[PDB]
Nucleic acid binder design. Structure first.
Lengths: 76, 57
RNA sequence: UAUAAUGGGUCAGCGACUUAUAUUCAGUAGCGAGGUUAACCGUAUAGGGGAGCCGUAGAGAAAUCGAGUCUUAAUAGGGCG
RNA sequence: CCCCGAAAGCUAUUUAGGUAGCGCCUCGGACGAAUACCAUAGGGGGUAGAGCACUGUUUCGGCACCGAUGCAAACUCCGAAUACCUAUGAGUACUAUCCGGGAGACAGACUGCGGGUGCUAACGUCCGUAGUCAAGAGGAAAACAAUCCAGACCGCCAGCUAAGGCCCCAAAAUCAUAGUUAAGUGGGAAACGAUGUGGGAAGGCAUAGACAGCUAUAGUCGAGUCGGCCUGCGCGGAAGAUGUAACGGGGCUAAAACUAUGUGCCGAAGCUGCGGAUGUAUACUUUGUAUACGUGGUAGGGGAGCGUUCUGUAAGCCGAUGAAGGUGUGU
RNA sequence: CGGAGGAGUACGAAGGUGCGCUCAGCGUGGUCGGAAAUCACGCGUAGAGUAUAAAGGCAAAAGCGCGCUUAACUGCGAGACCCACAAGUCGAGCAGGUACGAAAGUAGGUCUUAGUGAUCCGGUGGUUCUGUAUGGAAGGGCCAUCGCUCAACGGAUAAAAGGUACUCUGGGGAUAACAGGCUGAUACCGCCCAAGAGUUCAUAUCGACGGCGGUGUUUGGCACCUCGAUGUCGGCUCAUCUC
RNA sequence: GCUGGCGACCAUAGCAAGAGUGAACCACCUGAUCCCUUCCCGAACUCAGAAGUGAAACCUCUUAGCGCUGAUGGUAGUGUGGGAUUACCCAUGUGAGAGUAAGUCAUCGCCAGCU
């Protein structure tokens, strides 16, 4: 009899809206366990590190700053 | 400005997108010949199914 | 499944999606913001019988209001219309 | 008789060969480009590969460190092709979506590719992905659901081709030009063994005389000789039980085998030709007419009919100058 | 019924806020004192930590301290993620009342992802709902909350173990025992290399460590045929084939 | 041309080494009276000031030492069609990682002082 045989239910993480798409305020952009992406302009961060839009516009990804963090912002 | 494309093999067992390329060019059966505009959009469909069409250029 | 898986020796006759009630949808006919009677009476498929049923208004657990109503301190917001 | 046409999945279940919601089929209504294929543009990635910068692991040196050197599903300093999301656009196509009536199905199989498990076993088992069967006929595979070619509306004693073939069984080349094989290899198999034969690139010795043989390094003779590397086709390794039985058979050797090139032909229910039927749509602005595209089908869904018994039409019509029934023939 | 680990909690601060601070390791010196307690100075360097398993994260540190505090609030909530249903997740912003800041501001529990249980039936607090003639009341409704290892964790009852060789029915070759089939780990047979044994001498005869095959007599693996029946361990009689 | 503040950018821009700067600015600097401060300490934070020094620090310049950037070509992988089954070959499209040549001691913006 094996001592293995367990696993957890899937969580369905990942990028939900890609660069160049238009969003409405409140749209979820990234589901992530940790801050793989950071919130830029017009983007808010939830209690579970979810990134969402706070304004209408076009999503844009970039690499910026002195640490080389990945940012996602919304351009109005 | 226009080219003629002839279907030379069966399409019954091909991939879904390959069958759709044939349909979007307008070919319907083996031996069928159609005349289409020479544009990159048509050339893409032709190139994807190069192996079962013949182009009189 | 040729299967060495099942069933039939052969012929003739019989042998299996019905009936009642309710409900929903579709066709078709009458009437139409209306439609329709049931039991019953009736020398009786007629003609009477309007009790009742469906439609015509929703919201709310309900009291209550009503083209609005519920929630709320709120004429904000939101849900059903 | 006509039209369309699945699934053997997900989730839950005293559930596992049952059932329910969703996925997939059909019919009616609404609504038309909102859909798809391809091109261009924007976007995230951590797989294949690779690497040692972390985590582990590995060998050899020098003094845990330094220099060389390997490995990894649960390592990553890196990192594709594809796939996926969005916007714009040409052409092609009855596409997409919404609301309702009716289902069936929830035992799958093989093959290729990426994997887990198993012994890199199984016509084994479990996933992802594509094709076929299931529910699909024809031709090629000797015979052979799942391989290759190809999707059967009906008829023809017409033609062209696909896969695969062209000496006879058995349709079409005893076709053409160059080579290779001698093993019936072709028409079953390994480590390994061998002066079998074809081709190629180098190297050594040699007519002031090479190799072998032969006489005591010299000497007779009189040209090539020697040892390796790469490569084409062959040989041994190779033992089983009913009967040749491991080309389907006959048979095949300047092939009817293999390699390369060319010109013809055969070959299907594919395509074309002629005749006929039927479904859908556009225009003829009744028509029943032309054009274009369709017509393989299990579970299922939809549409249209044939015959049988009885009631009215029917106190009608047919019938001993012969009804029903039985048995032939024609149409 | 593949390879590896965790959970059925904890915390009134380990929550909020304002201000403030950086770890781990090594080397030098310094009483007990050292391998390693505390002090001081350097060197290089995220290798520390984050209540807890791992992963994704963590400088405006999400790590670590101090003062004041209760936003571990009430009514909601545009818009999304996920999804058979039932469920689950993120959320800007508006109103009221707060806490900390001089202030711009931050706060609807904790870096996040586990720490859980539908419906029925009952208990408790509240209630400008209902109240079977009427006024009350009992009971019921609504809002908040309590009682499950119902752990077989979508939970058939509030309540449940065995035997049958004395047995029976409906089914299955959807699924085992015999024989057949596929496979060949195992089994049996053969070959390659050759340390060595053989007084010298690998190969007369053996032959270590390793490698490559054949057969289909063993033990097995699979579950394709047969469960509307393929009905046998040995002996007897009679055989036929392989090498 | 020098100095200060705030940004863009985040190593071709960084580290390391060497050398320079005092008019103004900045930095050390004086001590601790009132503000304020240390689980001790005027070390930091804070106040009130210029007796000294550019020593340290910060800035500026030089160096390819460490680091970083990095072609071309080839190789690996790979979508489609075909041929094979130790995982290759052909046609077509695509194309790394490592390494090699080579490059680098950044480049811009706003405001204010001193010549």
């Amino acid at each position: 009899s094996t001592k293995n045989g367990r696993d957890s239910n899937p969580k369905m993480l990942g990028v939900k809206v890609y660069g160049g798409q238009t969003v409405t305020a409140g749209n979820i952009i990234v589901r992530q366990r940790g801050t793989e992406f950071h919130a830029g302009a017009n983007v808010g961060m939830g209690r579970d590190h979810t990134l969402f839009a706070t304004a209408d516009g076009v999503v844009k990804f970039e690499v910026k700053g002195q640490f080389g963090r990945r940012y996602v912002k919304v351009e109005t | 400005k226009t080219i003629k494309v002839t279907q030379t093999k069966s399409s019954s067992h091909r991939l879904k997108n390959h069958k759709l390329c044939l349909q979007g060019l307008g070919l319907r059966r083996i031996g069928h010949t159609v005349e289409v505009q020479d544009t990159p959009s048509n050339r893409g469909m032709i190139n994807k199914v190069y192996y079962m069409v013949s182009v009189e250029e």
